[PDB]
Amino acid sequence: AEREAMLAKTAADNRKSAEQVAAAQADYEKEMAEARAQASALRDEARAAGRSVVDEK
Amino acid sequence: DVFYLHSRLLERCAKLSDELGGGSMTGLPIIETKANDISAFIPTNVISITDGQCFLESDLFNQGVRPAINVGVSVSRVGGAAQIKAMKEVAGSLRLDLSQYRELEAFAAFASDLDAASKAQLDRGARLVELLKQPQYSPLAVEEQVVAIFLGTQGHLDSVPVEDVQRFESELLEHVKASHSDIFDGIRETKKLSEEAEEKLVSVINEFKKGFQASDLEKESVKVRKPAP
Amino acid sequence: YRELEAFAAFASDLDAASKAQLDRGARLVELLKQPQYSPLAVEEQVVAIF
Amino acid sequence: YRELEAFAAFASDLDAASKAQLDRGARLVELLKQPQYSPLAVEEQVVAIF
Amino acid sequence: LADADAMHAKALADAKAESEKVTEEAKQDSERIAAQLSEQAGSEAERIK
Amino acid sequence: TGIKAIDAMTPIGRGQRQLIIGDRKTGKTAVCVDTILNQREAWLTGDPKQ
Amino acid sequence: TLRELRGRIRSAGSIKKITKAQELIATSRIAKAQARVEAARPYAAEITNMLTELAGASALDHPLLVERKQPKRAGVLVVSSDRGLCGAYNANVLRRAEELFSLLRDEGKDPVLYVVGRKALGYFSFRQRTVVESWTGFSERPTYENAREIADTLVNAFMAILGVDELHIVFTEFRSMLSQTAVARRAAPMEVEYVGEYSFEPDPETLFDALLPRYIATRVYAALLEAAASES
Amino acid sequence: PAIVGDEHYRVAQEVIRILQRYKDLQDIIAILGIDELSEEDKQLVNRARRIERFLSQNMMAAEQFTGQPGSTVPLKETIEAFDKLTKGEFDHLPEQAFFLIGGLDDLAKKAESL
Amino acid sequence: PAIVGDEHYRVAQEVIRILQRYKDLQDIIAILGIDELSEEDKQLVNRARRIERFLSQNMMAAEQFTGQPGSTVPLKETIEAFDKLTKGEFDHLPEQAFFLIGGLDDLAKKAESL
Ligand SMILES: Nc1ncnc2c1ncn2[C@@H]1O[C@H](COP(=O)(O)OP(=O)(O)OP(=O)(O)O)[C@@H](O)[C@H]1O
Ligand SMILES: [Mg+2]
């Protein structure tokens, strides 16, 4: 049973380590791009507010 | 005398010498071509009387190229002498580059074996064409123009998708105008894009590109030769 | 039928509806064909186009 | 030859007679070339075209 | 696998820090853009007057 | 002139004669009026040389 | 205007010459392709005959003859031209490929594409559909080596790598000299056909297993030859 | 855009762009047809033909000729329909559905008819 | 050939031959595409594009049109460069490398820059 579980762990770790490195890279990229998207939306909201204030004034 | 009529007129637009006061008169004669024929009589007369052309074509205007300058036919025989040194440095070969891009696009319309250099030229040309699009009643100061043309000529737009170039440009000049106006002030007062200012502008473009968000049934069978399985 | 026949001159195949349209159009063409100096009274024309 | 010239690119797909015609025509065209100020007596022309 | 856990946690922490920095810079640039547009509005109003 | 295409590819200098030539409704008067409008920043300088 | 019109006349005359030459050369290559289609007929007939004779004595448990318990991928081979000027040929082939995709999706199968010919590469790249493997440069003049390679790759994907539970082929059948129709065939797994009414070395089962890949290769070869004929 | 609005202007200029590109491809279409065009140009030509045919309308003065009653498409509906055409939302319908139809509801009705 | 020499005449007339053939082919290429030309014709078209662009020169009076200074190409160098182009010794360089260079040294420099 010990040999069996050892095989099982060798299998999972390799897999889970690979998948978790991939997931860490993907999640860092996703969070960074979400931050960029929020920044772009904020800048566009500022542009819209500026256009609105110039038009109203 | 129809030629004389125009020459007698247009030739009076001149840059007087310092002995005569240094004054000047710039002429922007406007000619209506019939059926896009720049090779007619009066058009060619005026073309030969003047120091350049801005051949606005309806085809390019419809294609979304506004102000619609046909780059190849258009020319300014004064050329760089009528540009500030920053603009001359940033756009010295821009017109010939765009003419070559148009020729390549006509040639490379259905060529599937494009070389790397040819495709790079096509991409740079498309980005420049987008960069030169400009809405009406939206003038740009000369410093903004040099920064914009700097984006394309030096290749900082090569990473932006074509359809976003107009936005990228439009945003960057604002980001500079709001945050790094020292570049614009340097260009305006000095009329030159100094090495220090060029480095600052490149760094600004890169830090903005970090934050820029781009818009992007028959069957095969084997006969077993027996009546049933 | 004119454009349908122009298309069918090189199309490999067409739907049964297209073939029916082509067959009807050929027949209408052969029907409107008329010999010279042989005008048809209006009722005869009505019957023919019928 | 002027009819076959369109097939110069695809000579491998031509009949042997047509390929021979194209090859003969190219050499005849080269034969009819002549440098300036160097006219040929009629006997020389006869041998050349021969 | 363990290192992977540590690297995932570090990547999440770095992503959070970089998101905070990016949003701070974005707020600063948005304030600058709003200031520029308000000054342009003042200039336009002066021109109209 | 305030237009990137003109000020970059076909620059117009003081003393030059630049022809704006084209068919109907291609942007000619737009170019010229934009050029006239772009001189307000210079007019406000109060300097005859500008 | 007159200058433009005469330039256009000269251009159109040159284009007419080129297109007429292409028409005649295509008439030649139709004959060549049809002759090569007929040349492969005896091999296909006799390999099919001995394949049926082996299936009579075979176990019929070879993977290529049994549907997977629940297929989830399906391979699709789209055979298309590698040069243009073929009219709707590529368009028709890829329209039938899309129809096959719809049929697979209705059945829940996810299609995965192998493509022969550049013109299909362009269409699938434009619509951003990934192609596992592609072959180019022989759609006009296919050779059995290319058919064998394509069949080998398809079969290897079938036995599996993620692999595919089913594999089809989409190509233009040369139904007649006047008409060519794009068709879809499920090349594997094959249905075992029974109809009413030999010795073997080294046994029937190993020989049958070794021969089925050859049958796949020869049928793909026939498909490529017939697609070349239809293209011409 | 200062007179008709941003959306109307954008849709009109996109339609003009598509039609001008279709006009540019006219000689190639005449000689070789849509088959030799690039896929982008092929899609553009399909929706250009559909746009050109959708610009046709059943005029109320034309009832004396074709017997078909005339339609009237409000400006908002025209803008929306042509935005959808330029975005390809209708490029699956047959070209015939757009002749002399005048509207979106009528377009759907004629699509059902075909 | 009796004045400018046999080498010069041969090179010039081969250049004219290539350019005339390219001019004739332009009609075919604009519609049928270059990929459907003969291999010899395709090679000739590439050489013709390179020759057309090499005939361009950065002139002294045109400095204010291109920014770059003027250049002078000796007659022997022109003959050698165009002879090589006509025999295809520069078919590996990109065509844009031949545009406004004026000489073989400038050709090599611009090829390196690309
Ligand atoms: N750069 C531009 N961007 C957007 N729209 C433009 C631009 N230039 C012109 N237009 C618009 O295109 C049309 C061209 O009008 P314009 O007055 O510029 O043309 P024109 O050459 O003077 O024509 P006309 O022969 O009718 O006098 C008008 O709708 C104008 O608003
Ligand atoms: Mg006007």
Residue to mutate among B61, B102, B105, B110, with most H CBs inside 10 A, is B110
The CA distance from B55 to B30, in Å, is: 10
Of H13, H19, H36, the CB nearest to B64: H13
Q: What is the DSSP letter of B53?
A: E
CA angle E38, E39, E44 (to 5 degrees): 95
The CA distance from B117 to B100, in Å, is: 13
Q: Which of F1, F6, F19, F26 most suits a substitution to test ligand 1, by most atoms within 8 Å of the C-beta?
A: F26
Judge whether E12 is closer than 8 Å to chain A, CB to CB.
yes
Q: In degrees rounded to 5, what are phi and psi of residue I99?
A: -90, 115
Burial of residue I89 (number of CB atoms within 10 Å: 0-12, 13-18, 19+): exposed
Note whether E29 contacts B177, CB cutoff 8 Å: no
Show the DSSP H helices in A1-57 as ranges. 2-56
Peptide bond preceding G202 in cis form (omega within 30 of 0): yes
Q: Record the tokens describing residue A34, joined without a space.
A: 């979400």
What is the three-class DSSP state of B221? strand
The CA distance from D48 to I79, in Å, is: 33
Contacts of B47 in chain F (CB under 8 A): 19, 21
Note whether B117 contacts I96, CB cutoff 8 Å: yes
Q: Record the tokens describing residue I68, joined without a space.
A: 């770059």
On whether residue G11 sits in a domain, the answer given is no
Amino acid, single-letter form, for residue G48: T
Q: In degrees rounded to 5, what are phi and psi of residue I70?
A: -70, 165
CA angle F18, B133, B211 (to 5 degrees): 140
Instruction: Determine the distance in angstroms separating the CA of E43 from the nearest CA of chain A, rounded to an integer.
Output: 9
The CA distance from C10 to C27, in Å, is: 21
Note whether B178 contacts E26, CB cutoff 8 Å: no
Q: Which chains touch E (3 or more CB pairs under 8 A)?
A: A, B
Amino acid, single-letter form, for residue B76: S
The CA distance from G55 to G61, in Å, is: 10
The CA distance from F46 to B198, in Å, is: 31
Contact yes or no for E8/A26 (Cβ under 8 A): no
Contacts of B218 in chain G (CB under 8 A): 183-186
Of B79, B113, B118, the CB nearest to I65: B79
Q: In degrees rounded to 5, what are phi and psi of residue D29?
A: -60, -45
The CA distance from B69 to F6, in Å, is: 8
Contact yes or no for D22/I51 (Cβ under 8 A): no
* I1-20: b (≥16 Cβ within 10 Å) or e: eeeeeeebeebbebbeebbe
On whether residue G7 sits in a domain, the answer given is no
Cβ of C20: how many Cβ atoms within 10 Å?
11
Contacts of G84 in chain I (CB under 8 A): 33, 35-36
Note whether D6 contacts G18, CB cutoff 8 Å: yes
What is the three-class DSSP state of C44? helix
Instruction: Determine the distance in angstroms separating the CA of G217 from the nearest CA of chain B, rounded to an integer.
Output: 13
Burial of residue D3 (number of CB atoms within 10 Å: 0-12, 13-18, 19+): exposed
CATH number of the domain to which G222 belongs: 3.40.1380.10
Which approach determined this entry?
A: cryo-EM
> Is the CA virtual torsion B186, B191, B193, B194 positive or negative?
negative
The CA distance from I40 to G27, in Å, is: 23
Of I35, I49, I95, the CB nearest to B113: I35
Q: What is the DSSP letter of H14?
A: H
The CA distance from G88 to G179, in Å, is: 12
The CA distance from B69 to B133, in Å, is: 10
Q: Is B95 a catalytic residue?
A: no
> DSSP of H34-103, one letter per residue?
GGGS-HHHHHHHHHHHHHHHHT----GGGHHHH-PPP----HHHHHHHHHHHHTTTTTTS-GGGGTT--S
The CA distance from G42 to B208, in Å, is: 68
Contact yes or no for I71/I106 (Cβ under 8 A): yes
The CA distance from I42 to I48, in Å, is: 10
Neighbours of ion ligand 2 (CB under 5 A): F 29
The CA distance from B56 to B74, in Å, is: 9
Contact yes or no for B86/B194 (Cβ under 8 A): no
Amino acid, single-letter form, for residue B109: A
The CA distance from C24 to I85, in Å, is: 63
Q: What is the DSSP letter of A1?
A: -
How many beta-carbon pairs below 8 A join chains B and G?
A: 72
CA angle G214, G215, G218 (to 5 degrees): 85
Please enumerate, by residue number, every residue of F annotated as part of a binding site for ATP.
Answer: 22-29
The CA distance from I101 to F18, in Å, is: 29
What is the three-class DSSP state of C34? coil
Q: What would you report as the CA-atom Rg of chain F, rounded to the nearest whole angstrom?
A: 12
Note whether D13 contacts G20, CB cutoff 8 Å: no
The answer to whether chain I touches chain D by having 3 or more C-beta pairs less than 8 angstroms apart is: yes
* Residue numbers of the domain that contains G52: 24-232
Q: In degrees rounded to 5, what are phi and psi of residue G79?
A: -100, 120
Peptide bond preceding H74 in cis form (omega within 30 of 0): no
Instruction: Determine the distance in angstroms separating the CA of B78 from the nearest CA of chain H, rounded to an integer.
Output: 33
Cα-Cα-Cα-Cα dihedral of G194, G195, G198, G202, to 10°?
-20
On whether residue G5 sits in a domain, the answer given is no
CA angle E25, E28, E33 (to 5 degrees): 125
What is the Cβ-side half-sphere exposure of residue G113, based on CA atoms within 13 angstroms?
A: 23
The CA distance from E42 to E36, in Å, is: 10
> Is the CA virtual torsion B45, B23, B191, B85 positive or negative?
positive
Contact yes or no for B151/B205 (Cβ under 8 A): yes
Contact yes or no for B93/B124 (Cβ under 8 A): no
Residue in this structure with the two tokens 């009589």, named with its chain if needed: B41
Give strand pairing partners of G166. G74
Give the H/E segment covering residue I64. helix I63-66
Cα-Cα-Cα-Cα dihedral of I82, I87, I90, I91, to 10°?
130
* G79-97: b (≥16 Cβ within 10 Å) or e: bbbbbbbbbbbbbbbbebb
Contacts of G215 in chain B (CB under 8 A): 222
Q: CB under 8 Å to G22, separation ≥6 — which residues?
A: G85, I36
Q: CB under 8 Å to G24, separation ≥6 — which residues?
A: D7
Contact yes or no for B86/B153 (Cβ under 8 A): no
Kindly give the distance from the C-alpha atom of residue H24 to the centroid of ligand 1, in angstroms, as a whole number: 22
Contact yes or no for H44/H18 (Cβ under 8 A): yes
User: Strand order in F18-22's β-sheet?
Assistant: B30-32, F18-22, B52-56, B75-76
Residue to mutate among E28, E32, E39, with most B CBs inside 10 A, is E32
For residue H54, which of H26, H36, H77, H21 has the smallest C-alpha distance? H77
The CA distance from H6 to G216, in Å, is: 60
Note whether B174 contacts E33, CB cutoff 8 Å: yes
Q: CB under 8 Å to B138, separation ≥6 — which residues?
A: none
Q: Record the tokens describing residue B218, joined without a space.
A: 């028959």
Cβ of B77: how many Cβ atoms within 10 Å?
16
On whether residue G15 sits in a domain, the answer given is no
The CA distance from B138 to B228, in Å, is: 83
Amino acid, single-letter form, for residue G208: F
What is the Cβ-side half-sphere exposure of residue I112, based on CA atoms within 13 angstroms?
A: 5
Note whether A42 contacts E23, CB cutoff 8 Å: yes
Phi/psi class of residue G60: alpha, beta or left (left: φ > 0; alpha: ψ in -120 to 50)? left
User: Three-state SS across B132-191?
Assistant: HCCCCCCCCCHHHHHHHHHHHHCCCCCCCCHHHHHHHHHHHHHHHHHHCHHHHHHHHHHC
Contact yes or no for B78/F13 (Cβ under 8 A): yes
Kindly give the distance from the C-alpha atom of residue B46 to the centroid of ligand 2, in angstroms, as a whole number: 17
* I33-71: b (≥16 Cβ within 10 Å) or e: bbebbeeebbebbbbbbbbbbbeebbeeeeebbbbeeee
The CA distance from H96 to H107, in Å, is: 10
Q: Record the tokens describing residue G206, joined without a space.
A: 């190993």
- Chain G positions contacting chain C at CB under 8 Å are 87-88, 92, 178-181
On whether residue G4 sits in a domain, the answer given is no
As for how many domains chain G has, the answer is 1
What is the three-class DSSP state of A32? helix
Q: CB under 8 Å to A53, separation ≥6 — which residues?
A: E34, E37, E38, E41
> Is the CA virtual torsion G142, G143, G149, G155 positive or negative?
positive
Q: In degrees rounded to 5, what are phi and psi of residue B121?
A: -60, -45
Judge whether I19 is closer than 8 Å to chain D, CB to CB.
no
Please report the atom of ligand 1 found closest to the CA of residue F24: 25
Q: In degrees rounded to 5, what are phi and psi of residue H6?
A: -70, -45
Query: Searching chain G, which residue's CA lies closest to the CA of residue I37?
Result: G18
Ligand nearest to the CA of F1: 1
Instruction: Determine the distance in angstroms separating the CA of G178 from the nearest CA of chain C, rounded to an integer.
Output: 7
The CA distance from C48 to C38, in Å, is: 14
What is the three-class DSSP state of B54? strand
Note whether E8 contacts A24, CB cutoff 8 Å: yes
Strand pairing report for B218-223 and G181-193: parallel
Amino acid, single-letter form, for residue H99: F
The CA distance from B110 to B108, in Å, is: 6
Contacts of I31 in chain H (CB under 8 A): 27-28, 31-32
For residue B73, which of B50, B54, B48, B93 has the smallest C-alpha distance? B54
Q: What is the DSSP letter of I34?
A: G
Q: What is the DSSP letter of I67?
A: S
Contact yes or no for G209/G62 (Cβ under 8 A): yes
> DSSP of B89-100, one letter per residue?
HHTTTHHHHHHH
Note whether B212 contacts A39, CB cutoff 8 Å: no
- Helices G204-231, G41-57: inter-axial angle, 10-degree rounding: 150
The CA distance from E27 to E23, in Å, is: 6
> Which residues does ligand 1 sit against, CB inside 6 Å?
B 32, 66-67, 134-136; F 24-30
Domains of chain I: 6-113 (1.10.1140.10)
Contacts of B212 in chain A (CB under 8 A): 40
Give the H/E segment covering residue D35. none
Q: Which of F1, F7, F20, F28 most suits a substitution to test ligand 1, by most atoms within 8 Å of the C-beta?
A: F28
On whether residue G14 sits in a domain, the answer given is no
Measured between its terminal Cα atoms, the distance across chain A in Å is 80
The CA distance from B54 to F6, in Å, is: 8
Kindly give the distance from the C-alpha atom of residue B171 to the centroid of ligand 2, in angstroms, as a whole number: 31
Q: Which chains touch G (3 or more CB pairs under 8 A)?
A: B, C, D, H, I
The CA distance from G210 to A7, in Å, is: 36
On whether residue G10 sits in a domain, the answer given is no
The CA distance from H56 to H82, in Å, is: 12
Contacts of E13 in chain A (CB under 8 A): none
Q: Record the tokens describing residue C24, joined without a space.
A: 């009807």
On whether residue G180 sits in a domain, the answer given is yes
Contact yes or no for B28/F20 (Cβ under 8 A): yes
Q: Which chains touch A (3 or more CB pairs under 8 A)?
A: B, E
Cα-Cα-Cα-Cα dihedral of B208, B210, B215, B216, to 10°?
150
Kindly give the distance from the C-alpha atom of residue B131 to the centroid of ligand 1, in angstroms, as a whole number: 20
The CA distance from D12 to E41, in Å, is: 76
User: Three-state SS across chain G?
Assistant: CHHHHHHHHHHHHHHHHHHHHHHHHHHHHHHHHHHHHHHCHHHHHHHHHHHHHHHHHCCCCCHHHCCCCCCCEEEEEEECCCCCCCCCHHHHHHHHHHHHHHHHHHCCCEEEEEEECHHHHHHHHHCCCCEEEEECCCCCCCCHHHHHHHHHHHHHHHHCCCCCCEEEEEEEECCCCCCCEEEEEEEEEEEEECCCCCCCCCCHHHHHHHHHHHHHHHHHHHHHHHHHHHHC
